[PDB]
Design a protein around this ligand. Structure first.
Ligand code: ADP
Ligand code: ADP
Ligand code: ADP
Ligand code: MG
Ligand code: MG
Ligand code: MG
Lengths: 363, 168, 372, 283, 7, 414, 184, 7
């Protein structure tokens, strides 16, 4: 189900509620929106007032708002007014950069994984017609690359590059209420460290939560996968293999798990019930790819001038779909939530996009 | 090269493939930038420990690591003074036209022979395995090039001598 | 440092391989060809110089020249190029990793040996090397200690009488006649038949023809008479273009030049006469042993019936009171290489090598005193 | 240029420019120029005084003392006639042209003056060859070390003549290249029939130089050319003298030419390397 | 060769 | 008896040559260089790779023009050079054949245009130190050499360091002021039009306005400019109608000689007698990018430097360079500069009233000999100065630091 | 300066187009016709000379003459006129903008080549150009490096044996027989 | 042509 939207890479992707609209960063000072047309994709809009590079996008299932969180230490909350899109300036008080962003299930606040050693949380205010920003800086010691949220919206996990993957506890009493009892802790006030990684296991590039809110998993640059099971006495499970570093995290159900990265194709994992150990699953996407070429009498002589005439586009990665699918940027979900996920999509640094399935394989 | 160079090439190729992974990291220390981290040496947070793949005292290679770039430095197997001179001159002539390469540096690391450079800006606009293949191929072909240069200079000396002696 | 490489710079072919193997790993002719035309196409800046099987394949647009002529090198650039090719492209082994063994014909100028040693020690900086004789390696391959060697190569034919544990340097005879002169005479006679061949490509073609459709004649006059009744001896060969050439008396005429050098105009004697003279110059007692053992080697002695003719001629010349035996192993082509490999494998020879330190301190003249 | 020339073209050019306008009346064209050539010798052209009707040429030979001791009376009348006068600059041979007298020849005189350095250098070698030719008792061997720290020695005995060269290389870069260059000098003989024998020696100085205080050291090679009358007679004398005198600069220039050749070859190979690299960029 | 024969 | 150093002034046009401590550049030869190239087609992966000794089988200098089987290929193009191998070949040929100087025991000074990039200077210095092994080297802009040579015009004993020089060139003519030995770095402008494109325009017009010449012997026909055949013109249209009215006496004739068949061919001389040299003050004719005069550029560059130096600078403008040999050039430049400066002064006085009268600014153009070559004498005096032997970069400096010692430029600094 | 124009001065037809396209953008025969009658009507002062498909359409009152005969040009004015027409009216591209490529049959006189180069460099002042052979371009089009070419054009038929990376100039045969003789 | 054939 491969498709191409641009030769150059793409930074981040965002989708709407009906999976009919797409957001693609062209690796330039703008962002584009693509819409479905029968069985085809075509450009619809063109949003641009940012003079820097965009590196984070997200979508609101109900509010239909889009946030551009990137360089220039700024962030604009896009909203739809009739048949056109307009910006909404926000203030974040950042000095270095901002990469990743994420909204909340209830659409009341959004967080930015800023590169200034700080994590910012903001909420809507009608008084000054602005977006106020708070800061979390106590335990943070380096950049944060991945953020994920919990149903109640009070627990936040902010992966960083300091061997740690920590949950936080943010509660703005202005637009938040007391959450129900949770196994983790006490839902303490904003700006505090709840718990830290058990030990040093590589950096962090992604995080994933569960509907029951009792299991957290993340990946690392050290070719490792972790699963913090809080239902038990903070049982921690680990797994490793010879695969290249992963750069994404997501799971299907309470036991499944999915990930992708420089391996160029999806890799599937699973978690046991009581054994406290994971396992491995190989190329759940498909068996393998194929390769082809042509004579190209013009090319046979065109390539000899610069490259060798006998040379060609064939590569060892053609057989296992490792030729053009250069790396994987992140992952998303298609249907429902993180319970069944009948379909899953992934982003590619090649500048394209692709879709997959979880039941079409039919074991 | 099965019994002489094959294992060395395999090991260095595997190391490069593992360390060829790169990603874009917004500048953490200097306002807003995406400049290479290895050259700056600002934060030890991103840097990875150096590695070396070598089998003799006078020949060596170095493999660096970072989010933005990976740097590799080689040391050739030069024995005689003519070999050193020819290697230096050939590398200098390679430097003088390094702009078209888009991969190579502009001056070798101190105390070492030529070194290369990679970045996230050179990984998508260019293929991945082709670059490592080219680095390998250069490593093998250096000896051929130096031997060919040596025989060429010897032939030149022979021809000039023959041309002069005829007059007598 | 586990094994050594043995290279035989044959006058018409090069043999190389590892020390220990029973067969060579590289067998290509000594050809260094260069383009003869101008060149028009733009998509190829290819290899101004050509060497090896590549030269043989595309010989039609190249001026093939043999670097070695009658056992003595004439162009050093070509020899260095072939050495580099064999070491790198084919063997893919660095000179420093293992030492090299070299062989040369007897009674060669000292200048060639000194230049070869200097080039090997300076250019490739080999850790150590040695220089030997093809005939002694032939003895080693044959697993014998006494006999007479008939090393009739492509460029030189020579004999070296030997006895148990010692040699006779004063009874060595070297004859310039070899395969190249035979090929030239074959071309000349093929002209008399009606087929013309001048350039080097047709030289290779005639070389192949001789390799495939030549044999020796027990009796010259009887064979000529039977040729007068030319209805069972003529044979046909298929040229690359498809033309068919019929060869009759030429099959057994060119080989007879070895026994009758007067055909080419050389005022010398045949191989039988030279071997008889060499054996006679030896001591009386060792004559019996030399007669009882006659080793032959080289690519010019594979003609069927050569052994029988040599035996008949020697018995006719020698007194008819003893027994003369000819030994013709079916692998004499690579006997020199096998002997070199066996000699290198010998434990006692691990110290006879010549290293860089002693060579530099002493000088190129050391090889002269190293086993003559 | 392959065989380095012996005629300095600077004097030829300036004398041609002066003489082409000579027949134009009272035209002094005051000239005062200083030059330099191989062997570390300085030339000087300058009028003797305010009188510009006479032009003078001088030399600053390093080994001039040996020439004066030997005596060059042959050179004072054979090649140079009455237009030679006692030294002025530094006790070194200096000549002048008398413009008031009609100069009949134009090219012959300029050519004769062009080879001044070799013309004066030959005074010793030609005289030694005459000594061995005439049958006179073999004149005592002599050593002639010119401006370069190296040395030159010659022995003139009966039935043959000898010459030995000492070589010194200054920069460490060119030492090995020159060693390689001279290694094959002693062997290349397959294209010469009537040529002298050539040999190279660096570790062991020849037994001839043991007594003589010639160039002696460690990083010094030696080259000897054996001389015979077949290539040292009255016909093939000038050519041999020119070849031997221009030996040093010949080696130097061809070393630099080889350096340029290898530079060109590596520059050519860079293109092949770039072509191999270009396989990584997409279509 | 140098004298006699070519090589 | 110390040996003199060597003076060389390389460039796009006729390369000056000679030794230091002398009053006349002995050798003045073009940059033409021969080569045994022909028609191969594989010319971008083996440019030449001449087998054997054919690599050096090439001549040089005036003798290289009359070789009709090779290729005359100029290596330089208005300072910047594409391939420098030809430059190295020319340098070795000159030093050995013509100069006959041993690099290991001599000092070489070289001159380059001010716009030369640092890379070219660095790499040429590296080439010199590697191949020639010259003990010392020094590179400097040619303006100061011209200023030093200008002292010979009058009153040499009267030291006069201030002034400005607008030098010519085969492909470049630059403007550089001097303020008591110290020049201004930012007040330098590079002019692309020079004495070569002028001849291109001359021949282009001639190939249509006249016939009777062969394609080969075109430049020799186009070199009427170097003759008395070009005068400058205070007015353009006036002389145009003067020619179009009479067109009888003002027209000249050419009597060149063919170099192949030895057959005389003649052509008349028309409007090109002045248009070419007039292009200097109207560069828009040839180069469309640079639609900017010269005199106004001179005043602008002289008006972008401190007040105390503006006054003496206008008083000293040196006429040095081949392209400046045109007659009445100085009159036109002086008149234009005087007009513009007087207008500026009057405008400045108009806004602020006063019965005063400032002393008029004096602008004078000096005509003298040495115009063809003003860089050689500067290099001679450069070599003769003992301090040159001390400022020159040494071998050990290049040994490990690299060739960056020669990267110093007058318009750079951090 | 982004592409180049390739023009083939065929003995009976002219092919031209941009460098990169797989088909020519201009295919018209080489005809330079002039009126043969007197002319009476007054409302026409039209084009004393005619070229191209126009000449083919109104060929009934014109004396058609082929400028090129058996591969060698006979009238230079006609060739310059056709060049101007193709460059301006059809291609509508100025010569200065892009360079031009020219092809000619083998064993042609050097005078034709020199005159063509001089006219191209002087009249249209093209930035650059080149001269090649039709057979080698045929090899390039066929995507092969070895073979024998049978370039039987309208004016000349010739063969040029080739081998890998080199040609054989001493085995070139040119035959004047061509389509015109067949038509006669 | 000039000699042989017309052109
Ligand atoms: N099958 C053969 N029959 C007869 N002669 C052969 C045969 N193969 C090669 N030859 C001849 O022997 C020569 C090569 O054998 P070789 O021993 O390698 O020469 P060398 O002495 O230089 O090693 C060739 O020149 C060829 O003429
Ligand atoms: N007397 C002259 N009249 C007209 N032009 C001249 C005259 N002398 C030189 N030129 C022109 O000036 C140019 C040479 O100036 P020059 O600066 O010496 O070249 P370069 O820049 O290499 O030093 C020549 O191209 C020549 O056309
Ligand atoms: N469809 C056709 N069938 C047969 N012959 C044709 C056809 N079209 C053209 N021709 C012939 O080929 C000639 C033109 O082909 P062409 O290759 O363009 O000549 P040129 O080589 O000079 O360009 C015509 O003169 C005509 O005789
Ligand atoms: Mg043999
Ligand atoms: Mg100039
Ligand atoms: Mg045609």
């Amino acid at each position: 189900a491969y498709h191409s939207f641009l030769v150059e890479p793409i930074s981040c992707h965002a989708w709407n509620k009906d999976r009919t609209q797409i957001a693609i960063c062209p690796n330039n000072h703008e962002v584009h929106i693509y819409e479905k047309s029968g069985n085809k994709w075509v450009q619809v809009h063109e949003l641009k007032e940012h003079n820097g590079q965009v590196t984070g996008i997200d979508w609101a299932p109900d509010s239909n708002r889009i946030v551009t969180c990137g360089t220039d230490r700024n962030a604009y909350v896009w909203t739809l007014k009739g048949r056109t899109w307009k910006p909404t300036l926000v203030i974040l008080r950042i000095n270095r950069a901002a990469r990743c962003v994420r909204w909340a299930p209830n659409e009341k606040k959004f967080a930015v994984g800023s590169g200034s050693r700080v994590i910012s949380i903001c909420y809507f205010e009608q008084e000054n017609d602005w977006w106020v920003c708070k800061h979390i800086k106590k335990p943070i010691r380096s950049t944060v690359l991945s953020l994920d949220w919990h149903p109640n919206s009070v627990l936040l996990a902010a992966g960083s590059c300091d061997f740690k993957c920590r949950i936080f506890s943010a509660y703005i009493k202005e637009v938040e209420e007391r959450p129900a009892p949770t196994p983790w802790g006490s839902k303490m006030p904003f700006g505090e460290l709840m718990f830290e990684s058990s030990s040093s296991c590589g950096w962090v590039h992604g995080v994933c939560f569960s509907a029951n809110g009792s299991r957290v998993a993340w990946v690392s640059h050290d070719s490792t996968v972790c699963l913090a099971d809080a239902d038990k006495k903070m049982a921690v499970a680990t797994l490793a293999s010879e695969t290249l570093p992963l750069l994404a995290v997501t799971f299907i159900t309470e036991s499944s798990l999915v990930a992708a990265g420089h391996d160029c194709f999806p890799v599937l994992f699973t978690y046991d019930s009581a054994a406290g150990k994971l396992s491995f699953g190989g190329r759940l996407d498909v068996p393998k790819q194929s390769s082809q070429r042509g004579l190209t009498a013009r090319e046979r002589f065109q390539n000899l001038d610069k490259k060798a005439s006998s040379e060609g586009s064939a590569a060892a990665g053609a057989g296992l779909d490792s030729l053009h699918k250069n790396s994987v940027s992140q992952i998303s979900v298609l249907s429902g939530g993180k319970a069944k996920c009948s379909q899953f999509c992934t982003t590619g640094m090649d500048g394209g996009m692709s879709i997959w399935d979880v039941r079409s394989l039919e074991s | 090269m099965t019994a002489t160079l094959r294992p060395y090439l395999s090991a260095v190729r595997a190391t490069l493939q593992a360390a060829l992974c790169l990603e874009n990291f917004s500048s953490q220390v200097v306002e807003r930038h995406n400049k290479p981290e290895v050259e700056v040496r600002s934060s030890k947070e991103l840097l990875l420990q150096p590695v070396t793949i070598s089998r003799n005292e006078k020949e060596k290679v170095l493999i660096e690591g970072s989010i933005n770039s990976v740097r590799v430095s080689i040391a050739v197997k030069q024995a005689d003074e003519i070999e050193k001179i020819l290697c230096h001159k050939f590398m200098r002539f390679m430097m003088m036209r390094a702009e078209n390469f888009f991969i190579l540096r502009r001056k070798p690391v101190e105390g070492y022979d030529i070194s290369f450079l990679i970045t996230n800006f050179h990984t998508e606009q260019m293929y991945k395995h082709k670059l490592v293949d080219f680095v390998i191929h250069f490593m093998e072909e250096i000896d051929k090039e130096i031997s060919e240069m040596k025989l060429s200079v010897n032939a030149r000396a022979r021809i000039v001598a023959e041309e002069f002696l005829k007059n007598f | 440092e586990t094994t050594a490489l043995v290279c035989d710079n044959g006058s018409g072919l090069v043999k190389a391989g590892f020390a220990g193997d029973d067969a060579p790993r590289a067998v290509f002719p000594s050809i260094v060809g260069r383009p003869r035309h101008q060149g028009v196409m733009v998509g190829m800046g290819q290899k101004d110089s050509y060497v090896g099987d590549e030269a043989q394949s595309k010989r039609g647009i190249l001026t093939l020249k043999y670097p070695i002529e009658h056992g003595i090198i004439t162009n050093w650039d070509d020899m260095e190029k072939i050495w580099h090719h064999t070491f790198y492209n084919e063997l893919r082994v660095a000179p420093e990793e293992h030492p090299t063994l070299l062989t040369e014909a007897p009674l060669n100028p000292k200048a060639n040996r000194e230049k070869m040693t200097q080039i090997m020690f300076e250019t490739f900086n080999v850790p150590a090397m040695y220089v030997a004789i093809q005939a002694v390696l032939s003895l080693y391959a044959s697993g014998r200690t006494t006999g007479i060697v008939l090393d009739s190569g492509d460029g030189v034919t020579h004999n070296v009488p030997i006895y148990e544990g010692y040699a006779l340097p004063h009874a060595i005879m070297r004859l310039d006649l070899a395969g190249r002169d035979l090929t030239d005479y074959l071309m000349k006679i093929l002209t008399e038949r009606g087929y013309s061949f001048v350039t080097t490509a047709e030289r290779e073609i005639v070389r192949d023809i001789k390799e495939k459709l030549c044999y020796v004649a027990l009796d010259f006059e009887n064979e000529m008479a039977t040729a007068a009744s030319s209805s069972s001896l003529e044979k046909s060969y298929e040229l690359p273009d498809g033309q068919v050439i019929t060869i009759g008396n030429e099959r057994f005429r060119c080989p007879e030049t070895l026994f009758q050098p007067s055909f080419i105009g050389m005022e010398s004697a045949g191989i039988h006469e030279t071997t008889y003279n060499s054996i006679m110059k030896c001591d009386i007692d060792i004559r019996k042993d030399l007669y009882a053992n006659n080793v032959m080697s080289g690519g010019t002695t594979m003609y069927p019936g050569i052994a029988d003719r040599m035996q008949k001629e020697i018995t006719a010349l020698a007194p008819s009171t003893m027994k003369i035996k000819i030994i013709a192993p079916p692998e004499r082509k690579y006997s020199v290489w096998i002997g070199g490999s066996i000699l290198a494998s010998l434990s006692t020879f691990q110290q006879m090598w010549i290293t860089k330190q002693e060579y530099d301190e002493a000088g190129p003249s050391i090889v002269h005193r190293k086993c003559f | 240029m392959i065989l380095l020339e012996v005629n300095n073209r600077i004097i030829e050019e300036t004398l041609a420019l002066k003489f082409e306008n000579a027949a134009a009346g009272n035209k002094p064209e005051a000239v005062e120029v200083t030059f330099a050539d191989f062997d570390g010798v300085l030339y000087h052209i300058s009028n003797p005084n305010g009188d510009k009707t006479k032009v003078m040429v001088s030399i600053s030979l390093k080994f001039y003392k040996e020439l004066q001791a030997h005596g060059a009376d042959e050179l004072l009348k054979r090649v140079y006639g009455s237009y030679l006068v006692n030294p002025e600059s530094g006790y070194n041979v200096s000549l002048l042209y008398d413009l008031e007298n009609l100069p009949a020849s134009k090219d012959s005189i300029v050519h004769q003056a062009g080879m001044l350095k070799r013309n004066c250098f030959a005074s010793v070698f030609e005289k030694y060859f005459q000594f061995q030719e005439e049958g006179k008792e073999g004149e005592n061997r002599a050593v002639i070390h010119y401006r370069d720290d190296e040395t030159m020695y010659v022995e003139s005995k009966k039935d043959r003549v000898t010459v030995v060269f000492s070589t010194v290389f200054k920069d460490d870069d060119d030492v090995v290249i020159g060693k390689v260059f001279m290694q094959e000098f002693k062997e290349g003989r397959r294209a010469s029939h009537t040529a002298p024998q050539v040999l190279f020696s660096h570790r062991e100085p020849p037994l001839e130089l043991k007594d003589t205080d010639a160039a002696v050291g460690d990083n010094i090679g030696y080259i000897t050319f054996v001389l015979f009358p077949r290539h040292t007679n009255a016909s093939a004398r000038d050519n041999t003298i020119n070849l031997i005198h221009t030996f040093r600069d010949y080696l130097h220039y061809h070393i630099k030419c080889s350096k340029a050749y290898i530079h060109t070859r590596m520059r050519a190979k860079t293109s092949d390397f770039l072509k191999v690299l270009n396989r990584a960029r997409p279509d | 060769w140098x004298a006699x024969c070519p090589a | 008896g110390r040996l003199p150093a060597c003076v060389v002034d390389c460039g796009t046009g006729y390369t000056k040559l000679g030794y230091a401590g002398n009053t006349e550049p002995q050798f003045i030869i073009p940059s033409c260089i021969a080569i045994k190239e022909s028609a191969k087609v594989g010319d971008q992966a083996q440019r030449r790779v001449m087998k054997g000794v054919d690599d050096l089988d090439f001549f040089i200098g005036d003798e290289a023009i009359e070789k009709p089987t090779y290729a005359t290929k100029w290596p330089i193009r208005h300072g910047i050079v594409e391939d420098w191998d030809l430059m190295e070949r020319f340098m070795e040929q000159v030093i050995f054949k013509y100069l006959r100087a041993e690099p290991e025991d001599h000092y070489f000074l070289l001159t380059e245009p001010p716009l030369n990039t640092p890379e070219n200077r660095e790499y040429t210095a590296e080439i010199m130190f590697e191949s020639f092994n010259v003990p010392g080297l020094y590179i400097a802009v040619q303006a100061v050499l011209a200023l030093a040579a200008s002292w010979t015009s009058r009153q040499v004993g009267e030291r006069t360091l201030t002034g400005t020089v607008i030098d010519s060139g085969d492909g470049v003519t630059h403007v550089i002021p001097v303020a008591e030995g110290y020049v201004i770095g930012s007040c330098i402008k590079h002019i692309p039009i020079a004495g070569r494109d002028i001849t291109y325009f001359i021949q282009q017009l001639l190939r249509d306005r006249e016939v009777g010449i062969p394609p080969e012997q075109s430049l020799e026909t186009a070199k009427a400019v170097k003759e008395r055949y070009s005068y400058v013109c205070p007015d353009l249209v006036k002389e145009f109608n003067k020619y179009d009215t009479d067109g009888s006496k003002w027209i000249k004739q050419y009597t060149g000689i063919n170099a192949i068949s030895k057959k005389e061919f003649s052509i008349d001389v028309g409007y090109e007698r002045f248009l070419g040299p007039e292009i200097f003050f109207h560069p828009e004719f040839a180069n469309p990018d640079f639609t900017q005069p010269i005199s106004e550029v001179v005043d602008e560059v002289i008006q972008n430097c401190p007040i105390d130096v503006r006054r003496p600078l206008y008083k000293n403008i040196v006429l040095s360079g081949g392209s400046t040999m045109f007659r009445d050039f100085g009159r036109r430049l002086q008149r234009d500069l005087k007009r513009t400066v007087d207008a500026r002064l009057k405008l400045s006085e108009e806004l602020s009233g006063g019965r005063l009268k400032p002393k008029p600014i004096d602008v004078q153009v000096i005509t003298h000999h040495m115009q063809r070559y003003a860089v050689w004498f500067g290099g001679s005096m450069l070599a003769s100065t003992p301090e040159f032997y001390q400022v020159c970069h040494t071998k050990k400096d290049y040994e490990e630091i690299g060739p960056s010692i020669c990267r110093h430029n007058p318009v750079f600094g951090v």
